[PDB]
Amino acid sequence: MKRNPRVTSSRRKCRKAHFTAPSSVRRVLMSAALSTELRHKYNVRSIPIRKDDEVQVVRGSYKGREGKVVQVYRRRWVIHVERITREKVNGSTVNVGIHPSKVVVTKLKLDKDRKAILDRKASGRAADKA
């Protein structure tokens, strides 16, 4: 289709890679849009999340829930957040999977290696803009 001698371009291949996600693939697809306050600090629109973050449902029917990211699932690429749930018949509460795109990052744990991601991407956005 559209241009360039490169490795990647194939409608089938794009699907194949992202569903079964190897570790580097997981982290880049774990990039979830920042809230507006955070966007003006780190000068980026989206960053990969964590487990000690807190993340707010904006998009869905489930909107208005907030919780920490309990788990992230490779095999079918989904993330699981606390308090976005559906109830089983007996009264058990089981988490409903949410895509990281849908959910928006309330709060960050900086870390040290995750912190490095913020710096490099920020530098990136500085270069184009000015």
The CA distances from residue 18 to 52, 100, 119, in Å, are 24, 13, 26
Q: Of 50 and 67, which CB lies nearer to RNA in the complex structure? A: 50
- Considering the rule CB under 7 A, would residue 41 count as an interface residue with RNA? no
- Considering the rule CB under 7 A, would residue 64 count as an interface residue with RNA? no
49 and 30 in contact (C-beta within 8 Å)?
yes
| Subset of 83-112 contacting RNA (CB under 7 A) | 86-92, 94, 96-104, 109-112
Q: Of 41 and 124, which CB lies nearer to RNA in the complex structure? A: 124
In the complex, least distance from residue 123 CB atom to RNA, rounded to whole angstroms: 6
Long-range contacts of 12-18 (CB under 8 A, 24+ apart): 18/77
- Considering the rule CB under 7 A, would residue 42 count as an interface residue with RNA? no
In the complex, least distance from residue 25 CB atom to RNA, rounded to whole angstroms: 8
Give me 75's structure tokens.
């095999």
**Cα angle, residue 55 at apex, residues 112 and 96 outer, rounded to 5°:** 125
